[PDB]
Every structure is written in C-alpha cells, then in structure tokens.
Amino acid sequence: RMGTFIGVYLPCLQNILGVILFLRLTWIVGAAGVMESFLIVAMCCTCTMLTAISMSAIATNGVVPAGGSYYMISRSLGPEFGGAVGLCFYLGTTFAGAMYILGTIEIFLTYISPSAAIFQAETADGEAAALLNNMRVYGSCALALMAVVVFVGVKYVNKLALVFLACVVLSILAIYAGVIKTAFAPPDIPVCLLGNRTLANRNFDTCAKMQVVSNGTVTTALWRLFCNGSSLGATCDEYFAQNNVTEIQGIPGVASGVFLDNLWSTYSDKGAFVEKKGVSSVPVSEESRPGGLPYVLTDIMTYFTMLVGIYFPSVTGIMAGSNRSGDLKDAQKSIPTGTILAIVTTSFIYLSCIVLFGACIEGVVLRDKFGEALQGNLVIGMLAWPSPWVIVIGSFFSTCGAGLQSLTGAPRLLQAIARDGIIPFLQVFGHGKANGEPTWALLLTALICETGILIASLDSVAPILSMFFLMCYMFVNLACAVQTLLRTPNWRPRFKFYHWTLSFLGMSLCLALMFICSWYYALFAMLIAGCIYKYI
Ligand SMILES: *[C@@H]1O[C@H](CO)[C@@H](O[C@@H]2O[C@H](CO)[C@@H](O[C@@H]3O[C@H](CO)[C@@H](O)[C@H](O)[C@@H]3O)[C@H](O)[C@H]2NC(C)=O)[C@H](O)[C@H]1NC(C)=O
Ligand SMILES: *[C@@H]1O[C@H](CO)[C@@H](O[C@@H]2O[C@H](CO)[C@@H](O[C@@H]3O[C@H](CO)[C@@H](O)[C@H](O)[C@@H]3O)[C@H](O)[C@H]2NC(C)=O)[C@H](O)[C@H]1NC(C)=O
Ligand SMILES: [Cl-]
Ligand SMILES: [K+]
C-alpha cells in the first residue's frame, strides 16, 4: 500500500517531463517569440488541466476498480468509449516510445559521440539525405535492444524508475542553478558573425579576420575556409570581402538586454541563414552559395501552428497517476489532488523556463537547435551551472527510461483491452507468459513503434502523437460531458469542483487545438473515430 506522493505525484512528473524541454523548447522560444510561446503553453496546459479535472471526476465517481486507467475509464464510462479511448491511448503510448528513443539516439549521435554513425556521405546534400538513414539504422538497433531488455528484465526497470526521475529532477535543478547564478558572473560564450549571417564555429578559433598577430601577416583559419587559397586576394567570396567579421557575446546575463530583443516572433523559412537584427550588413544580390560555407542553415520552415504540434508531447502523459489505482490508499482522495498538483508543477516549470530562456539566451543562439554556433555543444546545457555534461547525460538517461516505461506500459494496456471481448477481431493478443506479462502484444507494439521510427524525424513524428493524444482527451471530455448531460442512470461524481460546462470547454478547446495542428489528418481521424465507435 502506497500513499499520495509516491503513489501518484511522482509517476506523473516522471512521464510528463521528457525530451522536448531539453531538445526543442529553446528552438521554439527562438522561432516564435516569448508571447507566442506563452500562448502555446497556455493552450496546451489548459486542455490538459480541464481533462485532468474531468478524469478526476471519473476517478471519484463510484467504487473505482483496481488496475490500470483503462479499468477506471471503462467502468465509469460506456464500454464503447472504453475501447476507443484505450486504442487512442495505446497508439499514443507506442508513438511516444518511438519519439523518446528517437530523442535518445539524437542525443547520442549529435552531442556525445560525433565521431560515430558510419552511415554517412560526403556531399553537401549527402549529409541531409544520409542523416535519415543513419538515424533509421540506429533506431532499429535501439528498438530491438529495448524490446529484448523489456522482455527479460522487467524486474529491473521498476527499481530504475527512481534513478530516471532523480536524473531528470537533477537536470532541472541544474538549469535553475545556472539561470540564477548567471546574474552575477555570466559565462564567456563567443558567437561570431558577419552581420545578418552568423557562422558555425565547429572548426576554427579566434574568429577575427585576416591577420591574428603571430607575426602579423598570416591568414586566419577562418579566412582559408572561405577563400580559395591561403593567400591575400585569392579570389575569396564577394560577401566575405564586402562585410566585416565581429564577435557577439552569446548568453548574456539576465539583465534588461535581450528580453526586448527576443520578444516577437520571426518565422524564418527553410534554408535561410540565421540572422541577428540591429547589426549593419550590406547586400550582394548576385550569388548565394550556401553549400560548403560554414553558415548555419535552418531546419524545416517554421510557421505558427507547427510549433503546437512540436510542443504538445511536452505536456502529455497524465494517465500515469491513474495507473496504479489498485495499490493506493483512498484513491478517490489521492488521484484528484496529485494529478492536478502535478500539472500545476510542470506548467510552472515550463512557464518559468520560457520566461528565462527569453531573457538569458541570445535570439540568434536560440534558433540554432543543434548547437552549431556554440562549438557543437548543447544550448540548454551551456546554460547550466556546473557543466553541460550533466544535462546531456541527464536527458539521455531520462529519455531512455521513458522509452522503457512506454514499451512496458503499452503492451500491458493492449493485453487488457484484448482480454475483454470488445474487439473480436483482435482476441489473439491475450496470450501471456506464465509470470503474467504480455508476450504476443509486445510484437505488435514493437512493429508499430518501428513504423513510427522509420519516419526518423523528431519534428514530424511529434504531430502524430499529438493528434492521437488530442483525440483521446477529446473523447474523455465529451464522454463525461454527455454522461452528466443525459443524466445517465449511473453517473454520480463526488468531485466538488466539476461542472458539465468545464469538460465541455476542455473538449472544445483541444478540438480547436487538433483543428489548428493539422486538419488533413483531423478529417480522416474523426472519420474513423466515429466509425470505430458504431462497430461495438
Ligand atoms: C568593420 O568594423 C569596423 C568597426 O571597428 C567598422 O568599419 C568602421 O566603419 C566606420 C564607418 O565607415 C569607419 O569610420 C569612419 O572612420 C574614419 C576614420 O578616419 C573617420 O574619418 C570617419 O569620419 C568615419 O567615422 C571606421 O574607421 C571603421 N573601422 C575600422 C575599419 O576598423 C564596420 O563595422 C566594419 N566595416 C565594414 C562593414 O565595412
Ligand atoms: C539582413 O540583411 C539583409 C541584407 O541587406 C537585408 O535583407 C532585406 O530583407 C527584406 C525582407 O526580407 C527585403 O525586403 C523585401 O524585399 C523584396 C525584394 O524585392 C521587395 O520586393 C519587398 O518590397 C521588400 O522590400 C530586403 O530587400 C532585403 N534587403 C537586401 C537583401 O538588401 C535585411 O537587413 C536582413 N534580412 C532579412 C531581415 O531577411
Ligand atoms: Cl496522458
Ligand atoms: K510527456
């Protein structure tokens, strides 16, 4: 028997906090402004808070059965809602596992061991075409190893969830320690630029121009990289000879300097240079030549309503506190307080991190997303106090642990759906090992997660996860609303602060979020969502 803290509040903090806060929150604050990102996080936290209130009403209605969240949802709501919500949350869990192991592999390939990942080509576009294949092969390897270890060592991972959560909370503590200690002695982070273009200092040092005085008349290492020859006047690029070089102080301390700079959105295109406003730059207007030059070039084009689909997995995962409802003591009291306090905690964390990222990191550093301008390091790791080597290993361990947790929880939930004869076409996934864990569902989960991982892009596998979780939350909200609306013979919720209009407002809210994220998926998603509903 467990209580309130370890029973509910820690698993929610464990599975909510994940890869996005470490790998894409800074890029999101950079591409949009502080205001747009504020609006994004307000929406994505309001939908989850309203869904949590409705789910707490479910949790306090009646005698909650023991087991997972599916038993609660099925017993309280109708059976057909149970199957639809279970299918949606199952697909969400497996695609979230795909995204989490993708984040693990991205960390390992990009930040820790760059002298790795053999599957590469030597061409300007060859790297952009071979990164996907390299991430695909490492993804297949990691998924296979993950399924193998979760098929054997199930008694190992549950004792390791404590270590995973300790690692991620230590990472958050380090980020706050850095953002507080930057007020007295900010670090000396150099970022070099020609004006409205900035350079990726992976290779060179001392970004000053032609002659650093060793004897006074030797070319800079940067000079050779732009110019054809290591000599003066060796037919260098015209943009190099028109514009000057300078060095800006990346990550200034949080004092009145950059908050007004990073305020409004930019919404750059794909392939354009990352630009700093204010500095003077003359144009050329006859040549671009972006291939082999050390300019940092952007990722996929950034417009609003795409950042919603990138960001939303950062706030999801609230069905975890309702996962261990069998082993609680007075679960109807533990769940509605623990879940809502968890969402309040994570929303406070995200709002604080946004308002601090807007006010400490330079706006040209924010749009890096790969650390190409900070000597190939991590930007949020360079923000931390002791060393960036704690944040990279922290995110590595936490993301690998979250992936293990998803690959543990999704097959058990699929097995619990299949045991009930709600789906007669999929009864075969009811066989399990004599110990009691599922075996045949694990194959299907690993296969669906591989189908997810073959897309091999964290920025285009996140919207699928977002749409699935939005559909699940919308179904739960609509179910509670219409249940208390039609005054069903068995719907007696005992939660104090629960209306019929509050769940309706949540339903409409993340309906608008789904419609604003991607509408082309939304059409056929709502089409099949109604179609699976009538079959039962
Ligand atoms: C390279 O960086 C320097 C900043 O150190 C800038 O070039 C600077 O440009 C200004 C404006 O043309 C120059 O000032 C002028 O200076 C002369 C010097 O006698 C003065 O008589 C004029 O009244 C005027 O104030 C300044 O000398 C020059 N500094 C240099 C070359 O070190 C500029 O930001 C960059 N140059 C570019 C983009 O061409
Ligand atoms: C960084 O420096 C460049 C180099 O001067 C500047 O580019 C300026 O960017 C604006 C907005 O993209 C351009 O404006 C628009 O240009 C089109 C081109 O025909 C014109 O038809 C529109 O009416 C509008 O004025 C501007 O031409 C361009 N100036 C240049 C290239 O000399 C700007 O300071 C920075 N680049 C940005 C913000 O993209
Ligand atoms: Cl959830
Ligand atoms: K999450």
Side-chain angles (χ1 to χ4, degrees), residues 126-194:
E127 59 180 359
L131 188 88
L132 289 184
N133 284 5
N134 203 308
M135 206 137 76
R136 274 157 189 173
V137 69
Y138 272 65
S140 42
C141 163
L143 201 158
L145 192 149
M146 216 77 59
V148 162
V149 62
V150 75
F151 189 45
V152 167
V154 286
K155 77 172 188 167
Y156 297 156
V157 289
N158 294 93
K159 213 169 301 180
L160 281 183
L162 171 147
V163 174
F164 296 137
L165 188 43
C167 208
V168 71
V169 64
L170 261 294
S171 298
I172 301 311
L173 258 56
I175 294 173
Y176 277 164
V179 73
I180 290 179
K181 263 77 169 188
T182 177
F184 308 134
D188 186 70
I189 296 303
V191 168
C192 312
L193 57 91
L194 297 181

Coordinates of all heavy atoms in Angstrom, one line a residue, residues 126-194:
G126 N 24.4 15.3 -49.4 CA 24.6 14.0 -49.0 C 24.4 13.8 -47.5 O 23.8 12.8 -47.0
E127 N 24.8 14.8 -46.7 CA 24.6 14.7 -45.2 C 23.1 14.8 -44.9 O 22.6 14.1 -44.0 CB 25.4 15.7 -44.5 CG 25.2 17.2 -44.9 CD 26.0 18.2 -44.2 OE1 26.8 17.7 -43.3 OE2 25.9 19.4 -44.4
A128 N 22.4 15.7 -45.6 CA 21.0 15.8 -45.3 C 20.2 14.6 -45.8 O 19.1 14.4 -45.2 CB 20.5 17.1 -46.0
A129 N 20.7 13.9 -46.7 CA 20.0 12.7 -47.2 C 20.4 11.5 -46.4 O 19.7 10.5 -46.3 CB 20.2 12.4 -48.7
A130 N 21.6 11.5 -45.8 CA 22.1 10.3 -45.1 C 21.9 10.4 -43.6 O 22.0 9.3 -42.9 CB 23.6 10.2 -45.3
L131 N 21.5 11.5 -43.0 CA 21.2 11.6 -41.6 C 20.0 10.8 -41.3 O 19.9 10.1 -40.3 CB 21.0 13.1 -41.2 CG 20.8 13.3 -39.7 CD1 22.1 13.5 -39.0 CD2 19.8 14.5 -39.5
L132 N 19.0 10.8 -42.2 CA 17.8 10.0 -42.0 C 18.1 8.5 -42.0 O 17.6 7.8 -41.1 CB 16.8 10.3 -43.1 CG 16.1 11.7 -43.0 CD1 15.0 11.8 -44.1 CD2 15.5 11.9 -41.7
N133 N 18.9 8.0 -42.9 CA 19.2 6.6 -43.0 C 20.0 6.2 -41.7 O 19.8 5.1 -41.2 CB 20.0 6.3 -44.2 CG 19.1 6.2 -45.5 OD1 17.9 6.5 -45.4 ND2 19.7 5.9 -46.6
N134 N 21.0 7.1 -41.3 CA 21.8 6.8 -40.1 C 20.9 6.7 -38.9 O 21.0 5.7 -38.1 CB 22.8 7.8 -40.0 CG 24.0 7.3 -39.2 OD1 23.9 6.8 -38.1 ND2 25.2 7.5 -39.8
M135 N 20.0 7.6 -38.7 CA 19.1 7.6 -37.6 C 18.1 6.4 -37.7 O 17.8 5.9 -36.7 CB 18.3 8.9 -37.5 CG 17.9 9.3 -36.1 SD 18.1 11.0 -35.7 CE 16.8 11.8 -36.7
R136 N 17.8 6.0 -38.9 CA 16.9 4.8 -39.1 C 17.6 3.6 -38.6 O 17.0 2.7 -37.9 CB 16.5 4.7 -40.5 CG 15.3 5.5 -40.9 CD 15.2 5.7 -42.4 NE 14.1 6.7 -42.7 CZ 13.9 7.2 -43.9 NH1 14.8 6.8 -44.9 NH2 13.0 8.0 -44.1
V137 N 18.9 3.4 -39.0 CA 19.5 2.1 -38.6 C 19.8 2.1 -37.1 O 19.6 1.1 -36.5 CB 20.8 1.9 -39.5 CG1 21.9 2.9 -39.2 CG2 21.3 0.5 -39.3
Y138 N 20.2 3.3 -36.6 CA 20.4 3.3 -35.1 C 19.1 3.1 -34.4 O 19.0 2.6 -33.3 CB 21.1 4.6 -34.7 CG 22.6 4.5 -34.7 CD1 23.3 4.3 -35.9 CD2 23.4 4.6 -33.6 CE1 24.7 4.2 -36.0 CE2 24.7 4.5 -33.6 CZ 25.4 4.3 -34.8 OH 26.7 4.2 -34.8
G139 N 18.0 3.6 -35.0 CA 16.7 3.4 -34.4 C 16.2 2.0 -34.4 O 15.7 1.5 -33.3
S140 N 16.4 1.2 -35.5 CA 16.1 -0.2 -35.5 C 17.0 -0.9 -34.4 O 16.4 -1.8 -33.7 CB 16.4 -0.8 -36.9 OG 17.6 -0.2 -37.4
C141 N 18.3 -0.6 -34.3 CA 19.1 -1.3 -33.3 C 18.6 -1.0 -31.9 O 18.5 -1.9 -31.1 CB 20.5 -0.8 -33.5 SG 21.6 -1.1 -32.0
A142 N 18.3 0.3 -31.6 CA 17.9 0.7 -30.3 C 16.5 0.1 -29.9 O 16.3 -0.4 -28.8 CB 17.9 2.2 -30.1
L143 N 15.6 0.0 -30.9 CA 14.3 -0.6 -30.6 C 14.4 -2.1 -30.3 O 13.8 -2.6 -29.4 CB 13.4 -0.3 -31.8 CG 11.9 -0.4 -31.6 CD1 11.2 0.4 -32.7 CD2 11.3 -1.8 -31.6
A144 N 15.3 -2.7 -31.1 CA 15.4 -4.2 -30.9 C 16.0 -4.4 -29.5 O 15.5 -5.3 -28.8 CB 16.3 -4.8 -32.0
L145 N 17.1 -3.7 -29.1 CA 17.7 -3.9 -27.8 C 16.7 -3.6 -26.7 O 16.6 -4.2 -25.7 CB 18.9 -3.0 -27.7 CG 19.9 -3.3 -26.5 CD1 21.3 -2.9 -27.0 CD2 19.5 -2.4 -25.3
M146 N 15.8 -2.5 -26.9 CA 14.9 -2.1 -25.9 C 13.8 -3.2 -25.7 O 13.4 -3.5 -24.6 CB 14.2 -0.8 -26.3 CG 13.9 0.1 -25.2 SD 15.4 0.9 -24.6 CE 15.9 1.8 -26.0
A147 N 13.3 -3.8 -26.8 CA 12.3 -4.8 -26.7 C 12.9 -6.1 -26.1 O 12.2 -6.7 -25.3 CB 11.7 -5.2 -28.1
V148 N 14.2 -6.4 -26.4 CA 14.8 -7.5 -25.8 C 15.0 -7.3 -24.3 O 14.7 -8.3 -23.5 CB 16.2 -7.8 -26.5 CG1 17.0 -8.7 -25.6 CG2 15.9 -8.5 -27.8
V149 N 15.4 -6.2 -23.8 CA 15.6 -6.0 -22.4 C 14.3 -5.9 -21.7 O 14.2 -6.3 -20.5 CB 16.6 -4.8 -22.1 CG1 15.9 -3.5 -22.6 CG2 16.9 -4.7 -20.7
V150 N 13.2 -5.4 -22.3 CA 12.0 -5.3 -21.6 C 11.2 -6.6 -21.7 O 10.2 -6.8 -21.0 CB 11.1 -4.2 -22.2 CG1 10.5 -4.5 -23.5 CG2 10.0 -3.7 -21.2
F151 N 11.7 -7.6 -22.5 CA 11.2 -8.9 -22.5 C 11.8 -9.8 -21.4 O 11.2 -10.9 -21.2 CB 11.3 -9.5 -23.9 CG 10.6 -10.8 -24.1 CD1 9.3 -10.9 -23.6 CD2 11.2 -11.9 -24.7 CE1 8.6 -12.1 -23.8 CE2 10.5 -13.1 -24.8 CZ 9.2 -13.2 -24.4
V152 N 12.9 -9.4 -20.8 CA 13.6 -10.3 -19.9 C 13.7 -9.7 -18.5 O 13.4 -10.3 -17.5 CB 15.0 -10.6 -20.4 CG1 15.9 -11.2 -19.3 CG2 14.9 -11.6 -21.6
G153 N 14.1 -8.4 -18.4 CA 14.4 -7.8 -17.2 C 13.4 -6.9 -16.6 O 13.7 -5.8 -16.2
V154 N 12.1 -7.3 -16.6 CA 11.0 -6.5 -16.2 C 11.1 -6.1 -14.7 O 10.7 -5.0 -14.3 CB 9.7 -7.2 -16.4 CG1 9.3 -7.1 -17.9 CG2 9.7 -8.6 -15.9
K155 N 11.8 -7.0 -13.9 CA 12.0 -6.6 -12.5 C 13.2 -5.6 -12.3 O 13.4 -5.2 -11.2 CB 12.3 -7.9 -11.7 CG 13.7 -8.5 -11.9 CD 14.0 -9.6 -10.9 CE 15.4 -10.1 -10.9 NZ 15.7 -10.9 -9.8
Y156 N 13.9 -5.3 -13.4 CA 15.0 -4.3 -13.3 C 14.5 -2.9 -13.4 O 15.0 -2.0 -12.7 CB 16.1 -4.6 -14.3 CG 16.8 -6.0 -14.2 CD1 17.4 -6.6 -15.3 CD2 16.8 -6.6 -12.9 CE1 18.0 -7.8 -15.1 CE2 17.4 -7.9 -12.8 CZ 18.0 -8.4 -13.9 OH 18.7 -9.6 -13.8
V157 N 13.6 -2.7 -14.3 CA 13.2 -1.3 -14.8 C 12.4 -0.6 -13.7 O 12.6 0.6 -13.5 CB 12.5 -1.3 -16.1 CG1 13.5 -1.7 -17.2 CG2 11.3 -2.3 -16.1
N158 N 11.6 -1.3 -12.9 CA 10.7 -0.6 -11.9 C 11.6 -0.1 -10.8 O 11.2 0.9 -10.2 CB 9.7 -1.6 -11.4 CG 8.7 -2.0 -12.5 OD1 8.9 -3.0 -13.2 ND2 7.6 -1.2 -12.6
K159 N 12.7 -0.8 -10.5 CA 13.6 -0.2 -9.5 C 14.5 0.9 -10.1 O 15.1 1.6 -9.3 CB 14.5 -1.3 -8.9 CG 14.8 -1.1 -7.4 CD 15.4 -2.3 -6.8 CE 14.5 -3.5 -6.9 NZ 15.1 -4.7 -6.2
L160 N 14.5 1.0 -11.4 CA 15.3 2.0 -12.0 C 14.5 3.3 -12.4 O 15.2 4.3 -12.7 CB 15.9 1.5 -13.3 CG 17.2 0.6 -13.1 CD1 17.7 0.1 -14.5 CD2 18.2 1.3 -12.3
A161 N 13.2 3.2 -12.3 CA 12.4 4.5 -12.5 C 12.8 5.5 -11.5 O 12.7 6.7 -11.8 CB 10.9 4.1 -12.4
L162 N 13.1 5.1 -10.2 CA 13.6 6.1 -9.3 C 14.9 6.8 -9.8 O 15.0 8.1 -9.6 CB 13.9 5.4 -7.9 CG 14.6 6.1 -6.7 CD1 14.0 5.5 -5.5 CD2 16.1 5.8 -6.8
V163 N 15.8 6.1 -10.3 CA 17.0 6.7 -10.8 C 16.7 7.6 -12.0 O 17.3 8.7 -12.1 CB 18.0 5.6 -11.2 CG1 19.3 6.2 -11.9 CG2 18.4 4.8 -10.0
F164 N 15.8 7.2 -12.9 CA 15.5 8.0 -14.0 C 14.9 9.4 -13.6 O 15.3 10.4 -14.0 CB 14.5 7.3 -14.9 CG 15.1 6.1 -15.6 CD1 14.3 4.9 -15.7 CD2 16.3 6.1 -16.1 CE1 14.9 3.8 -16.2 CE2 16.9 5.0 -16.7 CZ 16.1 3.8 -16.8
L165 N 13.9 9.3 -12.6 CA 13.3 10.5 -12.1 C 14.3 11.4 -11.4 O 14.2 12.6 -11.5 CB 12.1 10.2 -11.3 CG 11.2 11.3 -10.8 CD1 10.9 12.3 -11.9 CD2 9.9 10.7 -10.3
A166 N 15.2 10.8 -10.6 CA 16.2 11.6 -9.9 C 17.1 12.3 -10.9 O 17.5 13.4 -10.7 CB 17.0 10.7 -9.0
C167 N 17.4 11.6 -12.0 CA 18.3 12.2 -13.0 C 17.6 13.4 -13.6 O 18.2 14.5 -13.8 CB 18.6 11.2 -14.1 SG 20.2 11.5 -14.9
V168 N 16.3 13.3 -14.0 CA 15.6 14.4 -14.6 C 15.4 15.6 -13.7 O 15.5 16.7 -14.1 CB 14.3 13.9 -15.3 CG1 13.3 13.6 -14.4 CG2 13.9 15.0 -16.3
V169 N 15.1 15.3 -12.4 CA 14.9 16.4 -11.5 C 16.3 17.1 -11.2 O 16.3 18.3 -11.0 CB 14.2 16.0 -10.2 CG1 15.0 15.0 -9.4 CG2 13.8 17.2 -9.4
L170 N 17.4 16.3 -11.2 CA 18.7 17.0 -11.0 C 19.0 17.8 -12.2 O 19.6 18.9 -12.1 CB 19.7 15.9 -10.8 CG 20.2 15.7 -9.4 CD1 20.9 16.9 -8.9 CD2 19.0 15.3 -8.5
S171 N 18.6 17.4 -13.4 CA 18.8 18.2 -14.6 C 18.0 19.6 -14.5 O 18.6 20.6 -14.8 CB 18.3 17.5 -15.9 OG 19.1 16.3 -16.1
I172 N 16.8 19.5 -14.0 CA 16.0 20.7 -13.9 C 16.6 21.6 -12.8 O 16.7 22.9 -13.0 CB 14.5 20.4 -13.6 CG1 13.9 19.6 -14.7 CG2 13.8 21.7 -13.4 CD1 14.2 20.1 -16.0
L173 N 17.1 21.0 -11.7 CA 17.8 21.8 -10.7 C 19.1 22.4 -11.2 O 19.3 23.6 -10.9 CB 18.2 20.8 -9.5 CG 17.3 20.9 -8.3 CD1 15.8 20.7 -8.7 CD2 17.7 19.9 -7.2
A174 N 19.8 21.8 -12.1 CA 21.0 22.4 -12.7 C 20.7 23.5 -13.6 O 21.4 24.5 -13.6 CB 21.8 21.3 -13.4
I175 N 19.6 23.4 -14.3 CA 19.2 24.5 -15.2 C 18.8 25.7 -14.4 O 19.2 26.9 -14.7 CB 18.1 24.1 -16.2 CG1 18.6 23.0 -17.1 CG2 17.5 25.2 -17.0 CD1 17.5 22.4 -18.0
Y176 N 18.0 25.5 -13.3 CA 17.7 26.7 -12.5 C 18.9 27.2 -11.8 O 19.0 28.5 -11.6 CB 16.6 26.3 -11.5 CG 15.2 26.3 -12.0 CD1 14.2 25.7 -11.4 CD2 15.0 27.0 -13.2 CE1 12.9 25.8 -11.9 CE2 13.7 27.1 -13.7 CZ 12.7 26.5 -13.1 OH 11.4 26.5 -13.6
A177 N 19.8 26.4 -11.3 CA 21.0 26.9 -10.7 C 21.8 27.8 -11.7 O 22.3 28.8 -11.3 CB 21.9 25.7 -10.2
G178 N 21.9 27.4 -12.9 CA 22.6 28.2 -13.9 C 21.9 29.5 -14.2 O 22.5 30.6 -14.2
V179 N 20.6 29.4 -14.3 CA 19.8 30.6 -14.7 C 19.7 31.6 -13.5 O 19.4 32.8 -13.7 CB 18.4 30.3 -15.2 CG1 17.5 29.8 -14.1 CG2 17.8 31.5 -16.0
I180 N 20.0 31.1 -12.3 CA 20.1 32.0 -11.1 C 21.5 32.6 -11.0 O 21.7 33.8 -10.8 CB 19.6 31.4 -9.8 CG1 18.1 31.2 -9.9 CG2 20.0 32.2 -8.6 CD1 17.5 30.5 -8.7
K181 N 22.5 31.7 -11.2 CA 23.9 32.2 -11.0 C 24.4 33.0 -12.2 O 25.5 33.6 -12.1 CB 24.8 31.0 -10.8 CG 25.1 30.7 -9.3 CD 24.0 30.0 -8.6 CE 24.4 29.5 -7.3 NZ 23.3 28.6 -6.6
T182 N 23.7 33.1 -13.3 CA 24.1 34.0 -14.4 C 23.9 35.4 -14.1 O 24.4 36.3 -14.9 CB 23.4 33.6 -15.7 OG1 23.8 34.5 -16.7 CG2 21.9 33.8 -15.5
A183 N 23.3 35.8 -13.0 CA 23.0 37.2 -12.7 C 24.2 37.9 -12.2 O 24.2 39.2 -12.2 CB 21.9 37.3 -11.7
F184 N 25.3 37.2 -11.7 CA 26.4 37.8 -11.1 C 27.7 37.7 -12.0 O 28.5 38.6 -12.1 CB 26.7 37.2 -9.7 CG 25.5 37.3 -8.8 CD1 25.2 36.1 -8.1 CD2 24.8 38.4 -8.7 CE1 24.1 36.1 -7.3 CE2 23.7 38.4 -7.9 CZ 23.3 37.3 -7.1
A185 N 27.9 36.5 -12.6 CA 29.0 36.3 -13.5 C 28.6 35.5 -14.7 O 28.7 34.2 -14.6 CB 30.2 35.7 -12.7
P186 N 28.1 36.1 -15.7 CA 27.7 35.3 -16.9 C 28.9 34.7 -17.6 O 30.0 35.2 -17.5 CB 27.0 36.4 -17.8 CG 26.8 37.5 -16.9 CD 27.9 37.5 -15.9
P187 N 28.7 33.5 -18.3 CA 29.8 32.8 -18.9 C 30.3 33.6 -20.1 O 29.6 34.4 -20.7 CB 29.2 31.5 -19.3 CG 27.7 31.7 -19.4 CD 27.4 32.8 -18.4
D188 N 31.5 33.2 -20.6 CA 32.1 33.8 -21.7 C 31.9 32.9 -22.9 O 32.7 32.1 -23.3 CB 33.6 34.1 -21.5 CG 34.2 34.9 -22.6 OD1 33.9 36.1 -22.7 OD2 35.0 34.3 -23.3
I189 N 30.7 33.1 -23.6 CA 30.3 32.2 -24.7 C 30.4 33.1 -26.0 O 29.7 34.1 -26.1 CB 28.9 31.7 -24.5 CG1 28.8 30.8 -23.3 CG2 28.4 31.0 -25.8 CD1 29.7 29.7 -23.4
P190 N 31.4 32.7 -26.9 CA 31.5 33.6 -28.1 C 30.7 33.0 -29.3 O 30.6 31.8 -29.5 CB 33.0 33.4 -28.4 CG 33.6 32.4 -27.4 CD 32.4 31.7 -26.7
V191 N 30.1 34.0 -30.0 CA 29.4 33.7 -31.2 C 29.8 34.7 -32.3 O 29.7 35.9 -32.1 CB 27.9 33.7 -31.0 CG1 27.1 33.7 -32.3 CG2 27.4 32.6 -30.1
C192 N 30.3 34.2 -33.4 CA 30.9 35.1 -34.4 C 30.0 35.2 -35.6 O 29.3 34.2 -36.0 CB 32.3 34.5 -34.8 SG 33.3 34.1 -33.4
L193 N 30.0 36.4 -36.3 CA 29.0 36.7 -37.3 C 29.6 37.8 -38.2 O 30.4 38.6 -37.8 CB 27.7 37.1 -36.7 CG 27.6 38.2 -35.7 CD1 27.3 39.5 -36.4 CD2 26.6 37.9 -34.6
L194 N 29.1 37.7 -39.5 CA 29.4 38.7 -40.5 C 28.4 39.9 -40.5 O 28.6 40.8 -41.3 CB 29.4 38.1 -41.9 CG 30.5 37.0 -42.1 CD1 30.3 36.5 -43.5 CD2 31.8 37.5 -41.9

